[PDB]
Swiss-Prot record, chains A, E, F, J, K:
The lineage of its organism: Bacteria, Bacillati, Actinomycetota, Actinomycetes, Mycobacteriales. Belongs to the peptidase S14 family. It comes from Mycobacterium tuberculosis (strain ATCC 25618 / H37Rv). This is ATP-dependent Clp protease proteolytic subunit 2. Its EC number is 3.4.21.92. Cleaves peptides in various proteins in a process that requires ATP hydrolysis. Has a chymotrypsin-like activity. Plays a major role in the degradation of misfolded proteins. Degrades anti-sigma-D factor RsdA when present in a complex with ClpP1 and ClpX. Degrades anti-sigma-E factor RseA in the presence of ClpC1. Does not seem to act on anti-sigma-L factor RslA. GO terms for molecular function: ATP-dependent peptidase activity; ATPase binding; serine-type endopeptidase activity. The chain holds residues 30 to 210 of 214 of the full protein. It catalyses: Hydrolysis of proteins to small peptides in the presence of ATP and magnesium. alpha-casein is the usual test substrate. In the absence of ATP, only oligopeptides shorter than five residues are hydrolyzed (such as succinyl-Leu-Tyr-|-NHMec, and Leu-Tyr-Leu-|-Tyr-Trp, in which cleavage of the -Tyr-|-Leu- and -Tyr-|-Trp bonds also occurs).
From Swiss-Prot, chains B, C, D, G, H, I:
Keywords: Cytoplasm, Hydrolase, Protease, Serine protease. Cleaves peptides in various proteins in a process that requires ATP hydrolysis. Has a chymotrypsin-like activity. Plays a major role in the degradation of misfolded proteins. Degrades anti-sigma-D factor (rsdA) when present in a complex with ClpP2 and ClpX. Does not seem to act on anti-sigma-L factor (rslA). Fourteen ClpP subunits assemble into 2 heptameric rings which stack back to back to give a disk-like structure with a central cavity, resembling the structure of eukaryotic proteasomes. Forms a complex with ClpP2 and ClpX. This is ATP-dependent Clp protease proteolytic subunit 1. Belongs to the peptidase S14 family. GO terms for biological process: protein quality control for misfolded or incompletely synthesized proteins. It is found in: Cytoplasm. Its EC number is 3.4.21.92. GO terms for molecular function: ATP-dependent peptidase activity; ATPase binding; serine-type endopeptidase activity. NCBIfam families: PRK00277.1, PRK12553.1. Coiled coil: none annotated. The gene is clpP1. One of its GO terms (cellular component) is cytosol.
């Protein structure tokens, strides 16, 4: 079988790239199967996606906070302003990231006034969600969000997103 | 040229301009160019402006309004077909006493429908929408609080209702 | 220009306009422009209007009707091909005594076929459909209850039936 | 203009019209426009009509026939290429004595090929098909029962057979 | 196998996004299989769809009210004027929703007169269906429908659509 | 497996939407398999299709009248002038319909004379087929067919198409 | 106009027509129109016809032949490029003594390549193919049984072979 | 030609040029060509430049600026619609005393948005962006540190704010 | 014609040619045709050549260079926009003393970018690339080893650097 | 089954051609399955790809350095400036290459300033990664990178990328 | 199963037509599976391809010379300048070809100078590879390569490509 099945057998949810309305119903269905099978074993999630939507982001954020199994987020590659929220929504002390990670935080993505209103609402909701986990204030995150902030693995440990950086386990 | 491109040119020599499509970044430039040409040809006549537009944007119609105000001639605006959220502003932009309307016109008092720069896009749209609500009250003479209530309801009008509302001044039933 | 775009221009100099397509937001503007040009060129002659339209909308034909009424000339409407729910209204819109029809014409007395603003779209369509049923009774002279019964049945007519119904006044079999 | 659009315009000044495509809602309008222009230019000459049509509709050709009858000139119809169910009706529609045919012409005596309104569409097609079978018998002079038998068999003709059948009156082999 | 099969094994009907004439025959077929297999165990339905049609909406509404098994609707994400009816058509006391839900109520989606007539008919039918479950009057729902009403999880509990808001079950 | 297989195991023929020349060979093949397997147990058919052709309609009508097993037609959703004939061709006393059904009866769908002749022939054949089951006369059905008649579940019971309207089996 | 559409018009004033494409339902109409225009302009001069056609149909070329015969002028046909099953018939259709050919011409003596009406389509093709084999023997003067044997073999010719075969009468190597 | 292509040509004879699209590799060439033509026709008049551009590139606008400086005439730039990161530079490029603006103009002070040669592409963009920030301070007269702070914030302006900022010199409300 | 096609024709009468696109097999033919036309019209004047090309091929630009050398007039080349590997060769190809440049020009000294015949394609490209490196040293006067070192580094230049390098002779800041 | 499955059964990761954002999640999933199955047996990787991206390159580079199993890179064909980093990131002494290998090293692949900045950053990161394994200095690799350097199997052994060249094992 | 699987069960590698960068990773994966399963039994390869690339040709040439199992190349049909190298790279004495084979040898398939340089390099590499097996000199093969040489089965036996021509095994 494909390696994705062998990973899911070990309760591994490999989030795909460019998560959207169609790619969220598959990751929200795996969080409900592993929670009913074994409710005390943790669930790890390898984060790799160059951005995505927001209408489906809040549907996975609370879903990760609704299951009883603890979430261990491991950042692989980058996270373009959408996967960083899921990386910071994991269990405190189990949020890991490779030393070559790029935690990006930028702006997410009548039909002109209500559109700007919904954009401001989702922006302040994302900022509140980020400040709830990182222990910071919404003003600082809003000041660091207007610019295309590019955080490295070492710059994200003291920022509040990740708690530990994984080292190389090479025997030679 | 073509058939529809020759009649418009022949009517341009008689100081007659048309607007039969939704005003956008294209039609607005042609309208301002025609108005400026008719103003440079003669500065002592009138420019008939037949309005029939099912819609359009406000950022493009504001330029047409400024061009109409800049021209030293006397714009005579007519309601040929139906005005929908952009033809009424140009119909009432003409000089008082030359705003006519056909007996089967439908003036729709309504506001126009409308990345990372959406904030400034909403701020720029909020500074020209209130300016339109001021010029509409200045032209029609109605209180300012009336158009802000008649704009969201999509209240359609007729040639007789628009006459008593303040949009037009006459109803040409049989004239020249 | 082209072949079909040159003959129409040459016929425009002789005060002859054509309508050979379904009247819509496009053809109506050209028709009103041609009528206004012919009215501004001379205000003491007649404008021959050959009608051949298999359909069209009412919102666009109402503007053509208002333009025909606004022109101080005498519109002479003809039934060249077949009128289908939009050519009859313009055929009967001409002055009484100049509405002719070819001996193989087919006048179709019928009404035109036709988000979140569907309510106002139905209210605006219900206020111009009853107005058309009034002008049709005023032109043909028949009682109002006759066209409301002959419109839903899609009752087709001939050149001889339309003469006694009230649509046209003459049947040109051999004339100039 | 173009190459083929300039030769037709130059021939129009010499009162010569062409028909080299299937008559439809488009070509019929151009043909009637050209005929009316040639009739308004002069009402004391002849209009040469070269016919070469592999098909067409009857609803559009009836308008061309009415336009030819309305013109006070003398239409001289020719059989240049081949007439297929629509060119013969216009070839025999000319005045008696001016219907010529080239020695390699092929006249095809045949009827034209042709939702919820199919009933009225069949009733309207059944009232103009019998009218065509009357004009065909009036022009050619043959009994009415002959064309109703020669139409369904797709009986093709030659320049010599069409001369004795009643379609044309002469066979131009070497003329001006 | 896919996680959808493992969910359906637990009698879980995960409604897809943008339900239409083609996506309704699959959800109406699952309500008839789980009803014949085990008729007293409840059937839960995770709601996630950004709107849809109405010609197929009334075919699923009565189908949910025809089976003998009780329906437990859990709103995941949003419901754009079409999934809200199915969320409110569940069993009273079992209509749940995540704290980040967006229960949207707006306007649903000769050929001009009969079209407006059918639109008015389906609109008043939807309003009657909503007032039957929420215990309100059709006038109030019609007054709140003309505008693009956006109801939150806390604003929908006292409105009559949902009965309880799910809390976070995180052990840390 | 898919729920369609679990339904067909219970002798359930779920007619798809927009039945045509290609979608009729699949429903005519299921009526011949269930008839040879168990010839006295009835076969139920859930009707859901927004219209269709007629050249394949008469191929399924007589096929439903040729098998020895009784047909129990249950209308789900609507029937746009094509599925209504199959709904009325079922066994008398077993033709059911949900209370939100829309039994539509309208006009079905040289090449101009023969086309109109075939249209008139199929129209009068459909009217005779409808009058044979509903016990009415062809004239009344022809008078009610020219207009876009929209019959409700309550208006179709006394019309002769359906015999009983299904009620809600909710225990709460 | 264009570049290639202006040179052809300028050459038309000097009584020079071209044929550089496969003769079909389109090019044949333009060719007959040009021939008739040149015949109506003057009836006492010659019309140079430069032939270069890699193919074509016979039903369309027959009309061109009848038009050439109808014109009272003297058609001077030339073999500019290569004649393939349709250019030879028009090359030999000119008056005897004016059929020239360039020294690098290739005349291909060959017949043209070509539902429920295929029977009448084959009968009509079998009545014009034998007529072509008669005119080819009348023009070239060769026995009739020679072309029926040289047509199926696709026997190509040169400027010197076509001179002694009977196609052309002269080989212009250095003339005006 | 066309309708919009004839009015621009007629206005070109009156020394009036337009800019109604995003300046790119295409519109810049036409603008420089028109400016050079108007400068070669007469070297003692003014050239009205109506600016309405929602964007554009700097590499193309620099050529337009050099062409405006090369012309010995007096460019009179106007703010017809809205200037967005490219119309302001050409609006302030005119001679001091002839830079007007309509009362509903929106000047957007902003910089333009923008393989293996990306290094030299960034070095060439960094040498012309600082040059633009020098000419902007030279024209408006404001300190250099002001535009470098007002450019990144996307600070929009009005006709009254741009007058006191240093962009334009007058606000034409009712003139010729 | 069009808008951009009429200004170029009007400037051609004043002996002014343009180059605003990448020189290829198309633009080179038009440039040589315009140069030959301007040389045949008058052989005692100057031909202004405004150069703005972001690239191009050498095989096509060599023909333009030979055409410029063949013309007995005095080509005055200007650096309007930016020269990229093909505009510099034509800018330095003009007569010494008439090679001007705008103060915001960017001359890019670079070589152009570029089955079974690739060997002869590389041999033909290697015999014209060394010829270009000889003419570039002959025009600018710099040693031959300088351009072979400045060509591979993609060294961009300014109007002041190209003046002292040997490309141009003057910097027109304010002239006619 | 396909030969790819029989290779993966022997812990063989055959990297495809033109690795990108979508082709990296499959090679990063195989490195996590073989590491959990048998953690001391080495994993060999046959390199064959004519270039690729860089945003996903650093996600596989650290992943190869994170697993406990040793990586044996064998170059098959060529490596166009992207697969060479993975070929040099293997275990020292186990980096092999066929005698007809072409180890290519060239340039990898407001939106103009930040784009050039990110390009320079990824370029210097790649140069540092190459100098860390080859034991050279970043300046020499940068001097050899500006030109389209084409290294042969014999020219890459003394360069520091590969350690040994495989010979032919033909018995005749 | 398909006949290709039954052939691969007998260690038969049927090379497809128009081998390219994508069709080479499948033939290079089969040479590594059959070599690990049974290392002394020979592997036969039926050659049938009307040409191909060269960047992937050298990746299969050395791969055929790297496995321990002997390669028996049997030419079926033709070989348009790309499959002839693989036909001549087989084991000496086991290179067979049908009597109706067409061994074609022709030319294989700044971006103008370096392209011609790479073309010349791959051409001389192919000529050296052909001269190494056929025992000829590179000059003669280069003289016979510039023209579209078409070698028959009888003309290729004395040329050095094939060693024996297969005869017909018909019993009647």
């Amino acid at each position: 079988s494909n390696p994705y099945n062998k990973l899911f057998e070990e309760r591994i949810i490999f989030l795909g790239v460019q998560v959207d309305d169609a790619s969220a119903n598959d990751i929200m269905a795996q969080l409900l199967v592993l929670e009913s099978l074994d409710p005390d074993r943790d669930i790890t999630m390898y984060i790799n996606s160059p951005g995505g939507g927001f209408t489906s982001l809040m549907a996975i954020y609370d879903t990760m906070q609704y299951v009883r199994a603890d979430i261990q987020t491991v950042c692989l590659g980058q996270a373009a302003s959408a996967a960083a929220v899921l990386l910071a929504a994991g269990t405190p002390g189990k949020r890991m990231a490779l030393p070559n990670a790029r935690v990006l935080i930028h702006q997410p993505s009548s039909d002109l006034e209500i559109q700007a209103a919904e954009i401001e609402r989702m922006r302040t909701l994302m900022e509140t969600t980020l400040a709830r986990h990182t222990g910071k204030d919404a003003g600082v995150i809003r000041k660091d969000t207007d610019r295309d902030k590019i955080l490295t693995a070492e710059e994200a440990k003291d920022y509040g997103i990740i708690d530990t950086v994984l080292e190389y386990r090479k025997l030679s | 040229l073509s058939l529809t491109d020759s009649v418009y040119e022949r009517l341009l020599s008689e100081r007659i301009i048309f607007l039969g499509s939704e005003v956008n970044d294209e039609i607005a430039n042609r309208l301002c160019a025609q108005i400026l040409l008719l103003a440079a040809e003669d500065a002592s006549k009138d420019i008939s402006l037949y309005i029939n537009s099912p819609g359009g944007s406000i950022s493009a119609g504001m330029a047409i309004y400024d061009t109409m105000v800049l021209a030293p001639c006397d714009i005579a605006t007519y309601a040929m077909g139906m005005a929908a959220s952009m033809g009424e502003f140009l119909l009432a932009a003409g000089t008082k006493g030359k705003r006519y309307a056909l007996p089967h016109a439908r003036i729709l008092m309504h506001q126009p429908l409308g990345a990372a720069d959406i904030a400034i896009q909403a701020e720029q749209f909020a500074v020209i929408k209130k300016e339109m609500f001021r010029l509409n009250a200045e032209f029609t003479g109605q209180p300012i609080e009336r158009i802000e209530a008649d704009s969201d309801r999509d209240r359609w009008f007729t040639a007789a209702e628009a006459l008593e509302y303040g949009f037009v001044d006459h109803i040409i039933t049989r004239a020249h």
